[PDB]
Amino acid sequence: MGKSAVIFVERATPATLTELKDALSNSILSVRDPWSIDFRTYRCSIKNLPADVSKLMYSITFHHHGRQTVLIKDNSAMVTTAAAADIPPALVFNGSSTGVPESIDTILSSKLSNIWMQRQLIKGDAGETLILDGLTVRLVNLFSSTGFKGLLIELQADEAGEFETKIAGIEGHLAEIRAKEYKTSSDSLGPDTSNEICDLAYQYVRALEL
Amino acid sequence: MNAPDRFELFLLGEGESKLKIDPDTKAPNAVVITFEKEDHTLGNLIRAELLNDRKVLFAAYKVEHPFFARFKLRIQTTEGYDPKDALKNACNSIINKLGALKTNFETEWNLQTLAA
Amino acid sequence: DDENITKLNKEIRAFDKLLNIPRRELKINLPLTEHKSPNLSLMLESPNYCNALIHIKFSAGTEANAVSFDTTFSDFKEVEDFLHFIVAEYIQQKKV
Amino acid sequence: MVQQLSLFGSIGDDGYDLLISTLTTISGNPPLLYNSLCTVWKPNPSYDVENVNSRNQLVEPNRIKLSKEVPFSYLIDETMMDKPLNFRILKSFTNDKIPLNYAMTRNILWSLQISDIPAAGNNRSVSMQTIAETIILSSAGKNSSVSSLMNGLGYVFEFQYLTIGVKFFMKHGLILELQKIWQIEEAGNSQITSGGFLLKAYINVSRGTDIDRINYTETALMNLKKELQGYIELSVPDRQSMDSRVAHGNILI
Amino acid sequence: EGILDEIMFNHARIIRSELLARDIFQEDEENSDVLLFQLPTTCVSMAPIQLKIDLLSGQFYFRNPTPLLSNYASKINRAEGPEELARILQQLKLDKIIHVLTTMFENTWSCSRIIKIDKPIRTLLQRDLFIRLPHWPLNWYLILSIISSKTSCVVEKRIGKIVSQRGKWNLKYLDNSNVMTVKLESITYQKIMILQRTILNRIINHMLIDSLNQLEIRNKICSSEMINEQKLPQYIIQGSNTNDNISIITLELESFLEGSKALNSILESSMFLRIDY
């Protein structure tokens, strides 16, 4: 079972990504294609709500994992696809689907706009992915509406035996570059049920919260 | 009332690129670069720094209408040299100069406080 | 579900042994003393039905999972050269 | 999102077997069995949606459809494994009773779908409807379930039903469906399409702006209808019957 | 049909004659429509490959093309200029040799496919390959400069130190006194492994020399030839039974003491550092 972790640095500089790319250059084995990610928050527009019912809904869009959206609310996850190649053949065959769906963000922001309204949008484009010995590291700069926000690091490994050691090593590597205020997370949404992309989205939410 | 919101001066709209580079069809090795949500403060500085490179032939900017915050820059350099590289060198030189200026001012202010 | 689709699937799958890509594997065990028996597994494949790809996995007599070498070859000349090199290395190991 | 161009009709079960022969004579393809299960959800009345812009009517509340395929092992009773799984089994599905009951469907709790009333005007020869669709692949969390998800969005369950029928694929992407519909409640199961089959012939268009394609689709549908003249009458249903907004309640069945 | 076939054959013959005039492909005596391209399959082997012209559409093809061979045949097919074709064939020979030697290294060695130097290293096509091992000292790389000519190829093996700063590759240090100039044919597996064994000792001598330079201490290496010449004191050579684990370095007394000239009259100007692993 693969494991993943996410570390977000808030006080980063524009050139911190290059600094961390060069500081790890000795162990860098290869480089792969760039990636992107989107992060929306939707708000509840109804006022007759109970106290225990949350008001937000976080939508995370993964571009490299085959164009998939994940909706998060109160530690509850939902995974939607929008590509014609991800459709289970039964739904196509029986007639439950017309074959060319839409992203759930269009549905939230077009038809249900009287229940949910957008509040923010944080984007990340042209990230870099590096293959190290039994590890893959992805770096990207986060841009909000106002401007630069911070640095995002996501780590994925296939063997879970020595994940903590790798996390500690990367934390130390950030330490020599004097990035001392960083928030990390490797939590799991469900102890018994393990879905990789849902757990990744939950870790993103836990890292990016203010 | 038709007065536009003020925050359109410093917040980019969605789907807006802060830079847009377009090759110029008249002179070889020339590019026109549009900057958004910016005014003379940046264009004057960048053009004055780009005028110090011996390999830079032409460097000029303009702000077509004082209603909109945007401006155009035009660069032309010698053969075998990229205008984007010239822009990068100019920005690096400006950043180094500003850092030296800040260090000097801090030293002088601390000396004055000691003498205060 | 429907009879027709399952019938066609069965009839098409019946021809897998003919339509599928041919493969071969050869395992060579060399008799060595000191409980150090290297293994030489060579699998030959034709991914595009015409080209020959030879994957060589040579495991020295050190550990069951410490694969000493694992390489791929598309030229028989390089296959012979690496085989000669492996034979020479084994002879040197037997001489030390 | 698609523009679905459709024509409707109905037949009595007496001619059913003779109809199936004729279709096979035209398309060249046999029928393929299928089934499905649809659940309809409506906005929660406990929540006051003042956001409906009453002075402008920017939007009106609507109903959401969630569909799923169910294996035939839930629909075949102990008397029916001997027969093979093909179109002939529909001949035994004439009773209001069905193996799938309320408790099993409650235990189950996909494709999410929303639609609008067809286009107005009397110069339309086929029912043109707009559909917005998405797919739910999986989920997780402490309350991973369709019911909990739709309550999180703000919707509640209204009813459900079960469709069983056969499909014919013809040229140009034309799909012809013969259906039987069973409404399901804790009180029991009732076949609304009693003693007959509901016939629906339709095509999908991916982009509504392309008009050459839409004209071609209408030409194909009208040619198909003019082929079946004298046997079955295919007609445009009532525009006010295919309206699924919450304010007004009716259900084409 | 006969006229069309004659025109086809004449056009193919004209193209083939132009290629022969450029003297890139040798003439095939057995077949007048087959072109022979000379390519080294191994270090010592030098073999011809048969390229043929399609009589229908006119794309060059190999008899048994490898994936790289097929890729470069496709590259030849859409090529536009005779100079472009010659450059394509030169690059074909060059990267075929590079692939052969890289495979030779990997079948025994970790290359780097990330490092790009702004200026080629001073020693006709020059290619720089930077290899190392995980257990080597950081930033030290074995640098191979492959020099390919029209008829001969040579390899310059050196040891260097490179760092990456702000997105740039900086050649921190290069050694020129110990350049190994080796012919292409002579390189074999056994030479590769012997070089692998000796290069750690040579790198240890280089990183110690660089450390002595950062200390501004002059030094000289007592190489194998220096030891065999018996010019060194014999009591230092004693105990060195042809062992690569013993390294002797001559240091200047003034340099070791950082300019202390008062001790020059007591001790000899030359001292000897013998490091035993």
Q: Residue D186: which of D98, D109, D72, D106 has the closest Cα?
A: D106
Q: What is the dihedral of CA D239, D240, D244, D245, to 10 degrees?
A: 120
CA-based nearest residue in chain D for residue A196: D140
The token pair at E107 is: 């079948």
Separation of alpha carbons E14 and E20, rounded Å: 10
- Quickly list DSSP for A190-207: -SS---HHHHHHHHHHHH
| CATH code, domain with B24 | 3.30.1360.10
Are the beta carbons of B12 and A121 separated by less than 8 Å? no
Counting one residue from chain A and one from chain E, the pairs whose CB atoms sit within 8 A come to: 16
Q: Chains with ≥3 Cβ pairs under 8 A against C?
A: D, E
Largest CA distance in chain C: 69
Are the beta carbons of E166 and A26 separated by less than 8 Å? no
Identify all chain B residues contacting A14, using CB atoms and an 8 Å cutoff: none
Separation of alpha carbons E164 and A68, rounded Å: 36
For A38-74, letters b (16+ CB in 10 Å) and e give bbbbbebbbeeeeeeeeeebbbbbbeeeeebbbbbbe
For E188-212, letters b (16+ CB in 10 Å) and e give ebeeeeeeeeebbebbbbbbbbeeb
The token pair at A116 is: 């949910």
Are the beta carbons of B11 and A121 separated by less than 8 Å? no
Query: Resolution, in Å, please?
Result: 3.3
Per the CB < 8 A criterion, the answer to whether A47 and A24 are in contact is no
Among candidates A15, A18, A28 on the partner chain, residue whose Cβ is nearest the Cβ of E114: A28
A110 touches chain B (CB under 8 A): no
SS3 B80: coil
Amino acid residing at C1: D
A98 touches chain B (CB under 8 A): no
Q: Distances in Å between the alpha carbon of B1 and those of A139, B5, B6, B8?
A: 46, 11, 14, 17
Angle between helices B40-50 and B83-115 in degrees, nearest 10: 110
What lies within 8 Å, CB to CB, of D214 at 6+ separation is D3, D5, D205, D208
Among candidates C74, C81, C88 on the partner chain, residue whose Cβ is nearest the Cβ of E42: C81
CA-based nearest residue in chain C for residue E47: C77
Separation of alpha carbons E19 and E34, rounded Å: 12
CA-based nearest residue in chain C for residue D84: C3
Separation of alpha carbons E188 and E108, rounded Å: 12
Separation of alpha carbons A196 and A4, rounded Å: 8
E116 touches chain A (CB under 8 A): no
The number of domains in chain B is: 1
Separation of alpha carbons D176 and D199, rounded Å: 7
Look up tokens 């550092």; give the residue. E273
| Sign for the pseudo-dihedral over CA of E257, E260, E263, E268 | positive
Identify all chain D residues contacting C1, using CB atoms and an 8 Å cutoff: 32-34, 72, 85
Q: Which residues, listed in sequence order, are joined to residue D132 by a DSSP beta bridge?
A: D114
Helix (H) or strand (E) holding A46: none
Residue B14, min C-alpha distance to chain A (Å)? 8
Angle between helices E189-214 and C76-94 in degrees, nearest 10: 80
The token pair at E60 is: 């060059």
Separation of alpha carbons B72 and D85, rounded Å: 72
SS3 D166: strand
Q: Chains with ≥3 Cβ pairs under 8 A against D?
A: A, C
SS3 of chain E: helix, strand, coil, percent, to 5:
35, 30, 35
Per the CB < 8 A criterion, the answer to whether E128 and E120 are in contact is yes
Separation of alpha carbons E205 and E245, rounded Å: 11
Separation of alpha carbons D211 and A60, rounded Å: 36
Kindly tell me whether chain C and chain B come into contact, counting contact as 3+ Cβ pairs under 8 Å: no
Separation of alpha carbons A98 and D206, rounded Å: 9
| Residue span of the structural domain in which B98 resides | 1-115
Q: What is the dihedral of CA E254, E258, E260, E265, to 10 degrees?
A: -20
SS3 E17: helix
Separation of alpha carbons E275 and E277, rounded Å: 7
Phi, psi of E256 (to 5 degrees): -65, -40
Kindly tell me whether chain D and chain C come into contact, counting contact as 3+ Cβ pairs under 8 Å: yes
Conformational region of residue E258, where left means phi above 0, alpha means psi within -120 to 50, and beta covers everything else: left
